[PDB]
């Protein structure tokens, strides 16, 4: 199951991360048909724990389905309500998240990469380019 597999793939106990369950995953998700639908919330839970390891690799596993999953999934990240909750790792108020800085730097690696990977998606263009208006983006990261 989905659960099964991403938790294996973003276990913050693990020295390292499991590569094989990241694989697992987003296969997961292209075949179950919950997949596309509730793996997104399950992600974004993770990439917002206080625990930045838990973080770091749901970040991973995020990068790796976006990937190789297929248009459903694509199409529900490229939603706007699921990169709010992306963005909210970013929010720029007192006590308005509790992610660590490194993070905070991998979103916005991942959210301009999409911008040019995928400029055909409106609402991650106009994220990144909202965020850049808001001063929370000072300067485009590399690739």
Known sequence: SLELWLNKATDPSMSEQDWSAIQNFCEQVNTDPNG???APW???HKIQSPQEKEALYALT?????????????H?????????NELIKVLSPKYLG???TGKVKG???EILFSW?????????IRDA??????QGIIKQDPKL
């Open 42 to 44: 399950l992600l974004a």
């Open 106 to 108: 991998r979103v916005i």
């Open 128 to 133: 990144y380019q909202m965020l850049k208006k």
């Open 36 to 38: 596309p639908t509730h």
């Open 75 to 83: 199409s529900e990240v490229a939603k706007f309500r699921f990169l």
């Open 97 to 99: 998240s509790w992610a």
């Open 61 to 73: 596993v995020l990068e790796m389905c976006m990937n190789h999953c297929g248009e459903k999934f």
């Open 115 to 123: 911008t040019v990977w995928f400029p055909e998606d409106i609402k």
